[PDB]
Design a protein around this ligand. Structure first.
Ligand SMILES: O=c1c2sccc2n(C[C@H]2COc3ccccc3O2)c(=O)n1O
Ligand SMILES: [Mg+2]
Ligand SMILES: [Mg+2]
Length: 283
């Protein structure tokens, strides 16, 4: 998470956010940040029927989802609802039975998501996690999750604010990332100006007096910067995405044989999923 990036873009780079209806993304592959999507659904097997029904709704609306699951968290995190290892396990299990593709990301899903968008194997990466942009994703989608879908274009953010990726990462770090602390008393809108004018954090600290503006003690901003820039990702060229026919009788055995769901209610969910797979990927 980047503390307050969404509000920043809307204010000083609005030309990057284009608000669209779920219907205009017909026949479109999107990479779905599974951890962030489960976070949404947890608002109890709530995570599983969230993913069951929402994926059907996406598939009926033309969208072809591909979920990407978090792996091992990177060393640096100690600078800053709870998505567990079972939440992930059960969801993966479910998607497997629906014929939806999932991907086990080496580290953080929104980096691997971004990578699919870079390599151009999806249209966009669906997530509210704003640091997916910082991971270099050309297009981010918000609220795919009543509420409009906000499309973010990274080339426009960089174009308006007049910064390359590297500088942009440092802006994000100054806004407040998951990896390190920011410079206290530096507002987000003042952070922009200092990035535009002085380009990088190491420099900004130089033109800042140690008394008035102290940084974190042994501040790992450089390490954060390395992570956002060179993150551990999967190779999308090697990775293959396929949408299979759902295994219905096995899907019952799981949601109803293990997870106390309504059999005929799942039955119809699977039949809509199957029907839309014939609309989306008849092939
Ligand atoms: O997968 C996640 C998850 S799951 C729960 C939280 C996170 N975060 C931290 C931030 C990401 O952005 C957020 C946006 C909205 C609400 C919580 C957020 O939490 C993340 O950065 N990633 O990558
Ligand atoms: Mg993140
Ligand atoms: Mg994530």
């Amino acid at each position: 998470g980047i503390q307050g990036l969404a509000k920043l873009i809307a204010d000083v780079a609005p030309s990057a956010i284009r608000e669209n209806d779920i219907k205009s993304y017909f026949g479109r592959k999107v990479a779905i940040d599974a951890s962030m999507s489960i976070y949404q659904f947890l608002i109890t097997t709530s995570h599983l029927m969230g993913m069951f029904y929402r994926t059907i709704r996406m598939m009926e609306n033309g969208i072809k989802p591909v979920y990407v699951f978090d792996g091992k968290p990177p060393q640096l995190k100690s600078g800053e609802v709870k998505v567990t290892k079972q939440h992930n396990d059960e969801c993966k299990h479910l998607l497997s039975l629906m014929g939806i593709p999932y991907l086990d990301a080496p580290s953080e899903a929104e980096a691997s998501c971004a990578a699919l968008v870079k390599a151009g194997k999806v249209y966009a990466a669906a997530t509210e996690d704003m640091d997916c942009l910082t991971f270099g994703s050309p297009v981010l989608m918000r609220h795919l999750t009543k509420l409009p879908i906000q499309e973010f274009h990274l080339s426009r953010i960089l174009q308006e604010l007049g910064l390359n990726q590297e500088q942009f990462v440092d802006l994000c770090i100054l806004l407040g990332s998951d990896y390190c602390e920011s410079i206290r008393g530096i507002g987000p809108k003042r952070a922009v100006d200092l990035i535009q004018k002085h380009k990088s954090i190491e420099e900004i600290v130089r033109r800042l007096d140690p008394n008035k503006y102290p940084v974190p003690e042994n501040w790992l901003h450089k390490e954060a910067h390395q992570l956002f820039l060179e993150p551990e990702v999967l190779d999308p060229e090697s990775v293959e995405l396929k949408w299979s026919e759902p295994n219905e009788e096995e899907l019952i055995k799981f949601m109803c044989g293990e997870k106390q769901f309504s059999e005929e209610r799942i039955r119809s969910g699977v039949k809509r999923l199957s029907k839309s797979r014939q609309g989306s990927t008849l092939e």
